Design brief:
The protein is mainly beta and 251 residues long. It is 0% helix and 44% strand. It contains no helices and 24 strands. The strands form six sheets. The protein has a four-stranded antiparallel sheet, with no helix packed on it. Strands 2-3-4-5 form a four-stranded antiparallel sheet, with no helix packed on it. Strands 6-7-8-9 form a four-stranded antiparallel sheet, with no helix packed on it. The radius of gyration is 16 Å and the shape is globular. Bound molecules: copper (II) ion (3 copies). One copper (II) ion binds next to loops.
Length: 251
């Protein structure tokens, strides 16, 4: 499409991550206000999720049960809130330094980019101990996404590239993006198309499934994109750091 919609969030200061659930509810981490806001589909009014003690959130993910998972930079931890709950759970990750992105697969496994430790960690549902994914030579990961097959996609700031690992594989794959500068967020649709916020080039890049054609999505007026999400219809949602807004573009 050639229509971008500014969603009616208010008062954002460095919106850092975005997620969209199956109902079309949009969740945004508002880094500079220590909060996560949500907007139900068609609603005019955001609500603030009742995380307690949250500081400087980066990433957000939502599972099919509606549980919301958030990374907290200032406390170096990951928290989750079940739908309808007022009492978060701190997940049993350990030793995080700048947890930057979070994703949750269909089995409830939680994947977190640990930016300051140059690694991606994962925690199975019910486990108390993370494992480190075998992403050789990873540096400063920002964003993570997991697809319905369990393939994990990660952006690497220091190396300006995007890598993936299939479930059960030891061989990572470097995706055929070109010309990235500070890839931040990543999202993947069920067709396999991969969307990346190319923060240092002020643009959002699409790698079309199959053809591997890279295009720039026709967002307008961005002042450095951070987070990205894509819904089942192919609508792409982006957080715009310098303009303190969240915008969407239909396919
Ligand atoms: Cu931070
Ligand atoms: Cu970085
Ligand atoms: Cu920025």
């Amino acid at each position: 499409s050639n229509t971008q919609t500014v969603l009616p969030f208010t008062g954002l200061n460095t919106p850092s991550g975005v997620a969209v659930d199956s109902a079309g509810t949009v969740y945004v981490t508002d880094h500079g206000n220590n909060r996560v806001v949500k907007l139900a589909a068609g609603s005019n009014t955001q609500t603030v999720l009742p995380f307690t003690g949250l500081n400087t959130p980066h990433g957000v993910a939502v599972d099919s049960a509606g549980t919301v998972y958030v990374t907290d930079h200032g406390n170096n931890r990951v928290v989750k809130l079940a739908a309808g709950s007022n009492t978060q759970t701190v997940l049993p990750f350990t030793g995080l330094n700048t947890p930057s992105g979070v994703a949750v697969d269909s089995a409830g496994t939680v994947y977190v980019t640990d930016h300051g430790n140059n690694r991606v960690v994962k925690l199975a549902a019910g486990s108390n101990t993370q494992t480190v994914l075998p992403f050789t030579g990873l540096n400063t990961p920002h964003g993570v996404a997991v697809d319905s097959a369990g393939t994990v996609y990660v952006t690497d700031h220091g190396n300006n590239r995007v890598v993936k690992l299939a479930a059960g594989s030891n061989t990572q794959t470097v995706l055929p993006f070109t010309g990235l500068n500070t890839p931040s967020g990543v999202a993947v649709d069920s067709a396999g198309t991969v969307y990346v916020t190319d923060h240092g080039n002020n643009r959002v890049v699409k790698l079309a499934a199959g053809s591997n054609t890279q295009t720039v999505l026709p967002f307008t007026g961005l002042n450095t994109p951070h987070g990205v999400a894509v819904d089942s219809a192919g609508t792409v949602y982006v957080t715009d750091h310098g303009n303190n807004r969240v915008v969407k573009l239909a396919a």
